[PDB]
Amino acid sequence: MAEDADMRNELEEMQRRADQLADESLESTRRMLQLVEESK
C-alpha cells in the first residue's frame, strides 16, 4: 500500500495547497489594511 500511501500524501498535499493559498490571502489582506491606513 506504499503507492496508495503516496496517493493519500498527494491528497494531503492538495489540502496544504489550500492552506498555503489561504495564508498568502491573509497576508495580502494585512498589506491592504496597512497601505490603506498609511495613505491618510
Partner: protein, 139 residues
C-alpha cells in the same frame, strides 16, 4: 516668533511654533504647558473643516500627555474629549487608550505591551510617543 506672528494676525503659523514648543516642553518633563497648548490648538482646530481630521490626533497626544500625571485625571480627560468631540470616539485612539487603562487597572503590563506592539505593527511609532509610552510603562 509666535508672539510676533500673532501680533501680525497671521494664524496657522504661530500654531505650529506653539505645538513644537509644547512637544519639546513635554519632552523636558513639564506637562501642564504641553497639555494646555495641545488643548488650545485642538479647540482652535475643531471648527476648521480641513484641519478637523487632524484635530483628533492632537486630542490623542494631549490625553497621552495627561496620562503621566495620574490615572484618574486621565480617565476624566478621556471622558471630556469623548463628550466634547464626539467624532473622536470613532478613531482607534479611544479604543487604544481604553485598553491601556484597562491593562494598567489590573497591573496587566503584558496586555499593555501586546497592545502597543500590535499598534506598532499596524503603523510604525514615533520616538516621542515611544518614549512617553515607555516612561508610563515604568509604573
Amino acid at each position: 516668533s509666535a508672539d510676533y506672528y500673532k501680533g501680525e494676525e497671521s494664524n496657522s503659523s504661530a500654531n505650529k511654533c506653539l505645538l513644537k514648543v509644547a512637544g519639546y516642553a513635554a519632552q523636558l518633563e513639564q506637562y501642564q504647558k504641553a497639555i494646555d497648548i495641545y488643548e488650545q490648538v485642538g479647540t482652535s482646530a475643531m471648527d476648521s473643516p480641513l484641519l478637523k481630521y487632524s484635530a483628533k490626533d492632537y486630542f490623542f497626544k494631549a490625553a497621552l500627555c495627561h496620562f503621566c500625571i495620574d490615572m484618574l485625571n486621565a480617565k476624566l480627560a478621556v471622558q471630556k474629549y469623548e463628550e466634547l468631540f464626539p467624532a473622536f470616539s470613532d478613531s482607534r485612539e479611544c479604543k487604544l487608550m481604553k485598553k491601556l487603562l484597562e491593562a494598567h487597572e489590573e497591573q496587566n503590563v503584558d496586555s499593555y505591551t501586546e497592545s502597543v506592539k500590535e499598534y506598532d505593527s499596524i503603523s510604525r511609532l514615533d520616538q516621542w510617543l515611544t518614549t512617553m509610552l515607555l516612561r508610563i510603562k515604568k509604573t
